[PDB]
Amino acid sequence: FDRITTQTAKQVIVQKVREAERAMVVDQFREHEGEIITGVVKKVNRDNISLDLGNNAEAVILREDMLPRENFRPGDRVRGVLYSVRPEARGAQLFVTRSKPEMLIELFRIEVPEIGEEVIEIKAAARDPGSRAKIAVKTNDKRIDPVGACVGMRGARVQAVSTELGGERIDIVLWDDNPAQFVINAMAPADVASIVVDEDKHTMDIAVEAGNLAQAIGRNGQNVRLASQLSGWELNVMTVDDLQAKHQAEAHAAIDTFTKYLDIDEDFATVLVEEGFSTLEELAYVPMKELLEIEGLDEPTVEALRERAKNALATIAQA
Ligand SMILES: [Mg+2]
């Protein structure tokens, strides 16, 4: 049997008022969630700092939410993004960050009025906190230069953001709907010779012009990493010569895969690839009508090829 609750009139009145007021505080903080707030440093622990926001509001910037070489003294004014509010937490309930990408984004929202007005949209942001960052922007307004608005007059705006982030070097890149073009943009200041897009694997091979290699990679691989993070594509950087050489190796691997797992001769495999059939997946599930465009292949053979291809697919997947 469920329990029957008994309280006093005083208890109930007090409880309902406490809860109504507590919910108001929670709601207000949830309104400013994802925004930059300013706090005063109270205590500087070994793995975090305490912030005063007024009205008994205590916020924390954890170690992993700080910039690498940042040191704070009790009483300092610090800004950061309130990215998580946890009402039922026994410890801290307000979490502030300076290292997450949202910090970079919100700093640009402030510094660039065109972003505040939602005339310019931020489509991606990738950071290596304290060191380097990329941010992608776009506009649907024919009057606006989105990169220029973010850089500002003589770079004053982007420098302002960089200074707040301790000299973090920021590349402002133009968004593009074509992934290859976007990645080319994100790879700056590198000069790309050519890109091969593996759409199935969601990876890109990037050939970089001579002398532009160290830039393309960046120190410690920083630039291609940031470009990978910004675009969401896996990126492989190499020389022009390497890319050509890799292409031949892939062209042979396709034929050999066909010869081995379909048990056909090399001339047969070649014809398949020539007609645009380059993978075991394609052979398996292509409309059988598309395979009839090849002169020399009857309906029985195209049925047998599919069944061999489907078997190879099952074989490989379990291997
Ligand atoms: Mg390739």
Side-chain angles (χ1 to χ4, degrees):
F1 301 101
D2 279 275
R3 255 310 161 202
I4 302 174
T5 63
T6 61
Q7 288 186 314
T8 66
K10 295 179 183 296
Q11 278 175 338
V12 176
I13 285 176
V14 171
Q15 180 178 356
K16 293 310 176 186
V17 173
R18 284 179 179 170
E19 294 174 351
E21 213 56 37
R22 172 58 178 173
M24 280 286 93
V25 170
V26 168
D27 287 15
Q28 287 175 347
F29 284 138
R30 279 177 172 173
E31 293 297 334
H32 289 50
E33 188 176 358
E35 304 185 356
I36 286 183
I37 59 184
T38 304
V40 177
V41 187
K42 300 186 309 178
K43 286 170 174 287
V44 182
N45 306 278
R46 43 268 157 210
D47 292 325
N48 66 89
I49 59 175
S50 296
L51 298 185
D52 177 37
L53 310 174
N55 301 333
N56 303 325
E58 189 174 52
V60 61
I61 308 183
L62 304 178
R63 204 184 188 115
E64 58 273 56
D65 279 318
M66 291 187 306
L67 302 182
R69 283 299 293 258
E70 260 190 341
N71 294 320
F72 295 114
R73 203 182 176 278
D76 285 331
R77 297 229 312 173
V78 316
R79 298 185 300 177
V81 175
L82 175 63
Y83 67 99
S84 191
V85 41
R86 289 153 188 151
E88 315 293 340
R90 334 93 219 142
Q93 299 183 324
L94 309 176
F95 293 90
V96 179
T97 187
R98 285 179 53 83
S99 65
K100 281 175 179 52
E102 281 72 29
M103 181 65 179
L104 179 65
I105 292 181
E106 296 308 314
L107 283 175
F108 271 101
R109 196 183 305 272
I110 300 178
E111 196 68 23
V112 189
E114 286 89 349
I115 298 180
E117 302 160 21
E118 296 174 354
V119 174
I120 288 175
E121 180 191 359
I122 297 173
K123 268 214 153 289
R127 290 185 69 186
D128 197 346
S131 185
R132 195 174 178 182
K134 297 180 184 286
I135 185 168
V137 299
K138 96 167 192 183
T139 187
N140 285 316
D141 194 320
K142 70 182 185 189
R143 304 167 295 175
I144 303 304
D145 169 29
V147 176
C150 292
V151 173
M153 243 198 304
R154 286 178 289 189
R157 289 175 176 180
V158 60
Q159 170 64 271
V161 179
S162 176
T163 287
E164 174 61 32
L165 298 178
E168 185 166 326
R169 287 186 46 223
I170 306 167
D171 309 336
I172 296 160
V173 348
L174 191 57
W175 170 264
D176 200 280
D177 298 316
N178 184 274
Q181 188 58 51
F182 181 48
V183 161
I184 289 175
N185 289 4
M187 280 301 288
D191 286 279
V192 182
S194 69
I195 290 191
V196 181
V197 181
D198 197 317
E199 297 182 325
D200 294 342
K201 289 168 44 185
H202 205 249
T203 71
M204 296 194 182
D205 284 2
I206 305 172
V208 47
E209 219 73 72
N212 272 97
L213 287 92
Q215 246 178 2
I217 305 161
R219 59 205 203 186
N220 301 337
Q222 198 182 41
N223 192 68
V224 52
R225 174 173 160 95
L226 280 176
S228 178
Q229 284 167 4
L230 194 70
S231 59
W233 285 72
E234 177 185 306
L235 308 175
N236 307 282
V237 168
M238 65 201 70
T239 69
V240 285
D241 276 17
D242 286 339
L243 188 62
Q244 265 290 348
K246 188 183 181 192
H247 286 165
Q248 304 290 333
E250 290 179 336
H252 278 80
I255 291 176
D256 293 341
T257 297
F258 280 6
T259 294
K260 177 171 299 184
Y261 277 109
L262 304 181
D263 206 335
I264 65 184
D265 52 49
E266 223 168 76
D267 291 337
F268 197 178
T270 296
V271 175
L272 296 178
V273 186
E274 278 187 291
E275 299 297 328
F277 300 85
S278 58
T279 61
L280 283 173
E281 183 78 7
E282 285 177 343
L283 288 179
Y285 308 107
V286 67
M288 308 174 178
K289 311 89 196 173
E290 294 194 64
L291 211 62
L292 293 177
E293 294 294 330
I294 310 179
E295 184 70 12
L297 291 184
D298 47 36
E299 283 185 349
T301 299
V302 304
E303 279 286 0
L305 282 169
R306 295 171 69 86
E307 289 301 328
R308 295 197 181 187
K310 286 200 265 278
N311 286 345
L313 290 185
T315 300
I316 296 174
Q318 300 170 62

